[model samples]
Structures are given as C-alpha cells and as structure tokens.
Target chain A: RTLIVTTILEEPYVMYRKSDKPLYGNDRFEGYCLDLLKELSNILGFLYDVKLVPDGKYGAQNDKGEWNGMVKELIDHRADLAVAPLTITYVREKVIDFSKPFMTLGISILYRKGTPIDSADDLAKQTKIEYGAVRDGSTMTFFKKSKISTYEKMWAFMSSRQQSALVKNSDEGIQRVLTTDYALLMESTSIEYVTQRNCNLTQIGGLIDSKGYGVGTPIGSPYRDKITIAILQLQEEGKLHMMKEKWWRGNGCP
Target chain B: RTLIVTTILEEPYVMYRKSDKPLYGNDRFEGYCLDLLKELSNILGFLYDVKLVPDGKYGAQNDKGEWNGMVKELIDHRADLAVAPLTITYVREKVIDFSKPFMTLGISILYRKGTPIDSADDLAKQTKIEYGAVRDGSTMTFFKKSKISTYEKMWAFMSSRQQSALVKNSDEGIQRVLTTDYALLMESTSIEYVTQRNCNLTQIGGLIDSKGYGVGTPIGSPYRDKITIAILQLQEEGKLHMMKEKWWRGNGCP
Candidate 1:
C-alpha cells in the first residue's frame, strides 16, 4: 500500500503555509497534525502521502446512509489513514476504526465581535437572531438521531425557523458570521483555536456535547494499532498536550 | 385568590402605544398578546389583572436553583396566570404547569454569510469568530444550565472566551448580526419572518435544540385546564399563526 492519508483543510490541525519561494509536496502544508504525521512515519518506518478530502465534509452519512468525505475515502480503501480533527462517533466506528482519541471537544457558538449574543442565556430571551450547526456534523446527527425530548425540542425549534441556511463547512459559517447576522454551533476545541487567531470573533455559551478526535483507518487496516500506539506514546509523554497548546491558544489574537 | 395575570413588554405582543396624554391602567399597553389575553379572559370567564414582571425576565433558575422573572412570580403565587412567549422546559415544568403548547420552535443560528466565519467547533477551538444570542431567553438558560457532556462542554467553551457580549433583547442582537461580523443563536420561528423581509442576512445551519411555547401557571392551578382549552381552540382554528402573521410579519422590512 502507498499509505495514502486523507484529511480536510482545517486550521491549527491541518493548514497550508504561504511562502515567497515555491513549495512542493508536503512542504506546502503545516499544522499540528502535519507534524504529528511526520513523527508517526519516523516511528513506523513507512513512506506516506497526505491529501485533503475532495469534499470539505469531515464525513457524514447522506440520506441513503452512505458515508461521504474523508470517511468515504477510508471506506473505499482510497486512504490508509485519516489525520484531521475527525470526530469519533458510533456511526463512523461501524464503518472504520479510529485510533485512541487524540483530542476532546464539544459544541459551542461562534459569532462576530461587539454583538450582544454571548451565552445561551441570551438565546433564550430573544427571538431576533438565529443560530445554526453543521448539516452533516456529529452535532446534527446527535439531534436527528437521538430524537430525545431535549434534542427533539431543539430540532423542532430549528425546523420552525426561517432564513436559516445549512452550509458545508465551518469556514463558510465563520465567513457568514463575519459579514451577516448568523452564528455557528460547533465543537469547543475548534472554537478555541479559531478564537485565538481571529480577534474579530469569539466563542459564546458552552458546549452542547463532548467527543474526541481520532486518527481514522479502514476497518481492517493492519497499521491502525501501530499508529494508535504511537499516538498513545505521544499523549503519555505529554507531547500531544504540548503540541495543542503550541498550535491552539498559544498563538492567540494573531 | 385574585387572578393576577403576568406578562412582559414585548413589541407587537404587549407594547405601550405612543400617546401625548398620560395613559392609565391597561390602556397604557396594547399588542397581540394583550388582545389575546382579553379574549382568553372572556372565554374562560375570569376577572384578571395584568401585571409586568418587574425585572423583565421570562424565567430561569439561578446558580442556587432559585427561579427568576415571570416564572418566579408564578412560583411564589404572586400571579395565577402567566402569559407571554414563555418557553416550556422540563426544569420549569417541574415547578410549574404549562398549557398545551401554544407554539413550537427550535434553536437556529443567524449570521452574515460570506464574512470568512463559518463552522462552529472549528470556531470554538479557535478564538477568531464571535457570536451572540438573545439574553435571558430559553436558549440562554439552556446554555447556562449545568448538565452532562454537551452542556458542560458548552459552558467551558463559553467561559473560556475573551470576546463574548451579552445583549438585552433580540432586536438588538439582530441589528448587530445584520451589520457586524457577528452571528446570533435564536429561535427558528422568529427568523422565519425576519428572513422574509430582511433579505441581506440569513439563517445558517440547522437547530441544536427544539421546544414549545405554552401558557404557564403555578402548579395545580384549577384554571390550567381552561387556559389550555382556549389555546387549543385558537390553535385548531389556526388563529395563533394568524396573529403572528398579523403582528410579527406585518411590519416587515419595507
């Protein structure tokens, strides 16, 4: 196998670097995960390639229950590993195997600066503004699939609203929040990194749920365990935590 | 006990008409909710006095689990009938009884699209994007409530942010969401009409929570059944929706 790894374009974890000198191959990209992958390859003694998912989706099931995005690449055996902020959930576990959780987070709100929408406390009393979440994200799956009173009620509230647009990526959501009257319900970890870099926006309220990001592989991939071991070693030695601090909040307000 | 009906001052729902001469008593206020209350009393055969919640809070439990706003007034037996767009939640239901749902809604987000801010968790992990919501609304209370993973994580995410703002009302949140690089977490039903007229902004993503609006009363009130039946009749005839259209959507962005 060529050890093809598929991921999405995410900040802090996986992002392209700009340089006056022309860049080629992996030199064009840098982030926490990019560094991590390099460390893992050194340990595993295998050559590899990294590619962004063609579709921006982290991986969500369509109406027909078919997987899409990075998850789809793994399912089709088009990839050997997935190195991104891919959330580990029950649905995805059924189709592919995930390494030990590399990071943890939950849903939070993202909006522009100088607005009065801070916490969910504000959301409860006012009906003037609208809120939204990823269309095929684990958060949305929690609502549509859980069907519990709490989630169903949340769903009922959303379906009843007008002027809401179900968009593709957090970048799209953040773009709109910067230019229009909109908000994004997303994972807390992501919010942390985003808020650090862009002083124009902030995170509001708290998380709606908690999950972990894991390195993904095909269900039968032999290298899954070896890769997971490497991740665990990194975590045990506190490197994972240190790397996050370096790439996340440490680079604040840039 | 005297039938003390509790309400709040909401535009188009219960608002004071601008008059040069000093106004008095119920004449000082007018709105769809005021008119609806008049009809509710006539149909239920009650001599009721309408009063506003002193602090302008609909109702939420503080850190000590004590209630506030209209919900507080009803719990203390300061009022017998509680009206307004009070949302029904399990926590509130534990202390009060709600009439059959007068309205159903879900949580949605509002943001200005194309502003380089999208996706929620990614935003949450970073500090770049800022968002807002209606203060003191059910959504706000939900965010503040101490619960399991989702809420706990949400609380942590929001608590960690440096650029969050708390607004007074939905009108103010919407104004900011419209003009600033801000996003708002709000009710779907509210945005339903806002988007129809204000075409510059739009709703992003789906809902994170769903809920209903009901007439609330102190637990075990004999008149609870009466109020619910009146609401049911209004709903069956589609008059509730009609009223919203007449008031909320009538004064569109023209």
Candidate 2:
C-alpha cells in the first residue's frame, strides 16, 4: 500500500527540482526531504506518494484550536506522514505524533550585516530595529507563548503591530531583513541556509530555544514507531548528517 | 505508587551531595538528573525512589546477549525508569524504550591541553597518543558499529589493546587522560562538565557524531509517552537549559 506523504517547500528541505523538462509526481521534488523519504521507503519497504500541503503553512492552531497545514492533514487522516522540517512542540505532540527528531534546531535571528544587535535582548529592547517571525508559525508561537521576560516583551511589540511585523513565511521574512531595518526571528536551520546563500545576511546570537524536526504521523499511527526506529538507524549510521551536508553546501561567500 | 528509578553516579548528571550529616534515599543525590526527576514527578504526579545501579556500569550487552547495569534493571522489571546520562542508541532502543531525548549531544574527545591532537582522525592516525572510550558503553558501541572509515580504524586500534585502551568508566578514562599520553573519546556534554572543572582538560575537535540522552523505560511501558511529553514541556519552557546551567557551572578554569 502507498502512503500519502505531505510536505512543504522549504529551501534545501523540499524544493522543486530545477530542470529543462517538466517533472511529475514524486519526481517534481528534489532536496533533503526527498533523500530522507527515499531512505525511509527503502528501510520500511513501503511505497509513498508525495504531495505538497494544499495550504503552505507548516502547521499552526487557531483561536478555536483548529489546526491548519500539514498538521491538520495528519490529524484529519488526509496524509499518512508529514516529511518536512515541522518542529516537534508540546502542543503539536498532543495532537499528532512525531518521529524522533531527524534534525535539531532552535529560534534565532536573521538580520543584514553590520547590525549593532547581538542577541534577542537587543531586539526586544529596541524599537528602531523592528523584529518579527513568520506569522502563525512555530517561531511566532514560541514568542507568543513564552513566559520569559525578553521574549514576552518582544511578542508584545510584534502583536501590537501584527500587520507590519509578522510575515507570511520565511521567504517574506528574509526579504524584509534584506530590504528594511528589520530582524526576522526564525529557526536557526533556516537562518543557516539564508546566511549561506546571501552573504549580506547573517545570523545573530545563538539559538533561543531548542527543538527538532520530526516526521509527523497521525495519532496512534503504527508507522510512527517504525519511522522513529529508521531515523535512529540513520542517525547511528551518520546518514542524517551526510544528508544535511549534501543539501546545505552552497557557493562560498567572500 | 513510587516508581523505582535506576541511575549511575556521573558527575553533574548524578552525584552525591556534600554534607556533614548522613543523608538517606533520594536526599543523598543532587545534580541535573535529580532536578529533572523532580520536574517530571511534578508534572506527572508520581512519587519516585532513586537508587544507584548495582553493577556501576551504564549498560552494554555481553557476547551472550545478556544485558547488565541500569538497562538490565529495566529489562528485569527491577526499576520503573532509568534516568541518567544514558545515551539513546540504536542497540539499546531495541530492548528498552526511550523517551524523546532531553539532552542532545555527540561523541567528542576529552584530552589534556598542549597536545598536537585536534580531531579523531589525528588520534586514529597515531599510536603514540593512545585513545579509547569507557568499556561496554555507548561510545565504544558507536565505534564498534560504525561503518565510517575514521571510526572503524580507531576501533581497530582500541580493540587491539582492549585491556589498556578501554577504561572501566569515565573517571578511569579521565585519570588516563590526565596521567598519560592518552585521549578519552566520550560524550561532549560530559566533556563540557570536565573541562569546566579541570582547567588542564579541553574538548578536542567538533563532535564526531550526534546523539542524545533520554529517559529509559521497559519496552511497552505506559510512562514512555508521558515522560516524552513532559520533557518537551520542560524543554519548551527553557527549564532544561536552566537545569543544565545550574549543574554544569564551575569555578574559573584559570
């Protein structure tokens, strides 16, 4: 039986393959996640059909507690697995199961070079250098729900001017950092990708909070354990690190 | 009902508190793991009795496939939980269950200062500077099972002089590093603890491989998921990092 794997297009994780000819089905995608899915398929001996989430959001809960994006796909049984850089959070764990983290990361800042800011505290205390995260994403949710004083203060600033501060996605946030006096609070892994590709940008400070990207499965899915075991196998064999190195390698910046 | 928790004596993770008066039960223990136990108990509302493992080893399966130490305790139903700096490895995961990792770490070298050695490859290439890991531990298991050429070569060297190369524990390994021309391959987190307290020691090179320490339980135990959830909660709230800082802080190396 073939599984319906839901994912989002995030640079180096999931991306449309660059080619002169048109691609179809699973061949349409090429990136780290594609490699991961292929590995998982070989180990588990299960066929999978890849589908991009209809809505591009990774997944977030609304005021009414309704989930959207890939998470919703899992909860609603629309997708058998979510193979992307979806963060494993406490709230998300309650709703859907996640395999052991294939990759670990944390919240961080992406800003243009030559900035005086050094850490989250610097962004939280200053108003001239506005900061925000992807709207309704895990990064935003972290700031929104954080009890830490600096984080709470920063969230207050972003919430007060939601329209201008919050971005639709990482691409939008990265563009904002490049064009304006803005610092985009985002995932450290994403920040690494951006800083590598655009020499004008750099990551400020260390990770604010630690988390991991896991393969998502519906509650009580049998494949959850199998996927987790495979991940551990891959980790022990060092395939995960090799996969990251493969996709993350880019042109050198002067 | 109070859960029987099995652990080992490891600096910063589990240690006997300094006291002039006699201490009993859990009161005798104080460190990062103890603090973690308290937090987990509070969230899960379970009473726990902590006991040191009888064998004084973390755990490793013998040639006959019999397990020993804290892992055996869990397998034998002698303990409800095994919490320490117990690594979440692929082999161990097959016999006992692990909650999602509470602390992520990787294998690294613990070596004295002013040595020419900078990485595992350097150690593997030379015979003058003998290097090894704790006997019958995860580090040894990693090298034994690794397919990577560098680690495979290192393992050949250690296996050839098993009696001298493989120390009984981290303490013995540390002593070897301090007193002889030896380097100890150990977990990075433990290296951090040792380096902070012992000015003469320093971690050599970046991590060799990535892994984590997780709460362990008997296979099919109901507490696994609950503990995993509580860990994510602690992690999300920044308590894990705070606890680590509280325990790992040491006097200035100089």
> Could you say which candidate leads in DockQ?
2
- lDDT (10s digit) by residue, model 1, range B1-254: 34888999876678887999998877888877877787777777777778989988898777799989999999999999888878766567668867655666666777765555444443445544556566667766666654534445554555454425546788888898777666677777777657766777667766555456678899777677567567645643446656777777644443
In candidate 1, what are the lDDT values of residues A1-254, reduced to their tens digit? 45888987788888889899987877879999998898888778888888888876788887798889999999999889999988876677668877656675667788887876777556545556666667778766665654335545555555454526545678887787778777777788878877887888888877655456779999767676567567645653446766887787645474
lDDT of 2 by residue, B129-215 (tens): 889998878999899999999999999999884457899888899999999988999999999999998999999999988888999
- Residue B232, candidate 1: alpha-carbon lDDT: 49
Model 1 scores a TM of: 0.48
Best-matching candidate per lDDT: 2
Clashing pairs in 2: none
Off by over 4 Å in 2: none
Candidate 2 docking quality: incorrect, acceptable, medium or high: medium
DockQ for all models: 0.01, 0.78
Question: Tell me, what's the RMSD of every candidate?
Answer: 18.9, 1.3
TM-score of 2: 0.97
Could you give the DockQ of candidate 2? 0.78
